[PDB]
Amino acid sequence: LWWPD
Amino acid sequence: SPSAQELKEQGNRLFVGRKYPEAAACYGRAITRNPLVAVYYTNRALCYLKMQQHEQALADCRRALELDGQSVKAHFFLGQCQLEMESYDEAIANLQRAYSLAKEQRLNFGDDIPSALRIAKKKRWNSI
Ligand SMILES: [Cl-]
Ligand code: NA
């Protein structure tokens, strides 16, 4: 969740 | 001449390297190449959160939701923005929506969404 895609 | 996808990937690498304004600029370059991809905006909103630019993050989340109304990360980052801006009722709504959407999409983020929800409710109460 706390990382870019 | 890097493509949108290439610039997104470069921005991801800068993000992992903790170069947040540089990563945000890279996602902006991606948007220039293809401005119709919601992930570029939610990636940049995450950078803006790291940069304390909450209003800028909020605006990117709104752009993302216009392109992908089902985006879990767009709702989650919106709720995180609103939490830091002390809009607790909206934060709770967006975090609950993130939870429901992640369930609908069979995404497993561990306890990350429930944890954020408890903060917003706790903070909402502590403000009361
Ligand atoms: Cl991090
Ligand atoms: Na902040």
Q: Does B109 touch chain A (CB under 8 A)?
A: yes
**Distance in angstroms (rounded) separating the CA atoms of residues B22 and B31:** 14
Residue B89 is encoded by which pair of tokens? 């009722």
Note which residues in 1-30 of chain B have CB less than 8 A from chain A.
8, 11-12, 15-16, 23, 27
Q: CA torsion sign, B122 to B45 to B60 to B66?
A: negative
| Nearest residue on chain A to B112, alpha-carbon basis | A1
3-state secondary structure B10-32: HHHHHHHCCCHHHHHHHHHHHHH
Note which residues in 1-5 of chain A have CB less than 8 A from chain B.
1-5
Nearest to B48 by CA among B63, B66, B68, B67: B63
Cβ-contact A4, B64 below 8 angstroms: no
Experimental method: X-ray
Cβ-contact B24, B17 below 8 angstroms: no
Q: What are phi and psi of B52, to 5 degrees?
A: 65, 20
> Count of residues for chain A?
5
Resolution, given in Å to one decimal, reads: 1.3
B24 CB-near residues (< 8 Å, 6+ apart): B11, B44, B47, B48, B51
Please report, for chain B, the start and end positions of each structural domain, with discontinuous segments joined by +: 1-128
CB contacts of B112 in chain A (<8 Å) are 1-2
Homologous superfamily (CATH) for B1-128: Tetratricopeptide repeat domain (1.25.40.10)
